[PDB]
Paper text:
Acetylated lysine (Kac) in the N-terminal tail of H3 or H4 provides a binding scaffold for reader proteins such as those containing a bromodomain or Yaf9, ENL, AF9, Taf14, and Sas5 (YEATS) domain. Another Kac-binding domain, the YEATS domain, consists of approximately 130 residues and forms an antiparallel β-sheet structure that can recognize and bind Kac and some acylated lysines. Human YEATS domains bind to the acetylated N-terminal tail of histone H3; however, their Kac-binding preferences at the level of the nucleosome are unknown.
To investigate the folding and electrostatic potential of YEATS2-YEATS, we determined the crystal structure of the YEATS2-YEATS apo-form at 1.67 Å resolution. The overall structure was similar to that of AF9-YEATS with an alpha carbon RMSD value of 0.76 Å, indicating the absence of misfolding in our YEATS2-YEATS protein. The ability of YEATS domains to bind the NCP and nucleosome-free dsDNA is assumed to be regulated by their electrostatic surface potentials. On the electrostatic potential maps, AF9-YEATS had no apparent positively charged surface region near the Kac-binding site, whereas YEATS2-YEATS had several positively charged residues, such as K217, K233, and R280; these positively charged residues may interact with dsDNA and thus enhance the dsDNA-binding ability of YEATS2-YEATS. YEATS2-YEATS bound much weaker to the unmodified NCP than AF9-YEATS did, but it bound to 147-bp dsDNA slightly stronger than AF9-YEATS did. In our ITC analysis, YEATS2-YEATS bound to the K27cr-containing H3 (15–39) peptide with a KD of 340 μM, indicating that it was active. Hence, although we cannot exclude the interaction between YEATS2-YEATS and H3K27ac at the peptide level, our NCP-based binding assay revealed that YEATS2-YEATS did not prefer any of the examined H3/H4 acetylations. Our analyses suggest that the YEATS domain of AF9 binds the NCP mainly through DNA and histones, that of YEATS2 binds mainly through DNA, and that of GAS41 binds mainly through histones.
Author numbering: 206 to 296, 299 to 329
Amino acid sequence: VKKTIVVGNVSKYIPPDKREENDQSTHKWMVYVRGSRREPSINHFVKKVWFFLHPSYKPNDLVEVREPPFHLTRRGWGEFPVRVQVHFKDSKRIDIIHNLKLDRTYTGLQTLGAETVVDVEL
């Protein structure tokens, strides 16, 4: 019946020397869809997830993940709203907007950006 869905992102700063010749991206970010802290795995009631990205990611601005974990990894230089559509196995689809937050430690280590928490009724 009642389930918690968390859409979050981590990111790491890419130091200037470690950036690819043809890629001016400052960060590598990962958006994730998980359950509660108590039940992080959502594979048993989530069929797949669609990630709707910023137009700059065209033609790959819509990414489908059907196999857990429900993660998307990309490089970028900007914060934008990531639209996440979660498809449930029994019943139905819900849209979650996650405002991507990029690392400001500038350590080059992966840090938690932000988490968007929603309660779904099913």
